[PDB]
Amino acid sequence: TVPNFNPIVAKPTVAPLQTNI
Amino acid sequence: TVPNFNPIVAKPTVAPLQTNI
Amino acid sequence: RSARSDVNAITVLNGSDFLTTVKVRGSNNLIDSKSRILVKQPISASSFLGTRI
């Protein structure tokens, strides 16, 4: 039960147009 | 130590395409 | 004698890997049914050459 053998992680990030300030 | 002499504030706002309902 | 253990144990281990890329076939090549099959990858443990699994 070798833990964390080939772990991979996913994390999204939205890319909107015209980020306004 | 005159407080709040020339204060400025920034606040973003994302502008995504096709905001769906 | 030098006998080797007669114990059959289930060695379970977990991890991720990378199968392959997907290639959508496009209007030119997409003229048949088989043309719409983009990936045929077995899931046998020994079907992923580069991986360490």
Partner: protein, 36 residues
């Protein structure tokens, strides 16, 4: 479906779209060494 762009036009380049990962868990049973 057909591969199409912003417009309702189909593309003809036969491009690549992404990748596939396998998040797996396997139990092996009998130690050995397979030949090759």
């Amino acid at each position: 479906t057909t591969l199409l762009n912003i417009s309702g036009e189909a593309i003809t380049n036969d491009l690549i779209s992404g990748s596939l990962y396998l998040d797996w868990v396997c139990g092996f049973s009998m130690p050995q060494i397979n030949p090759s």
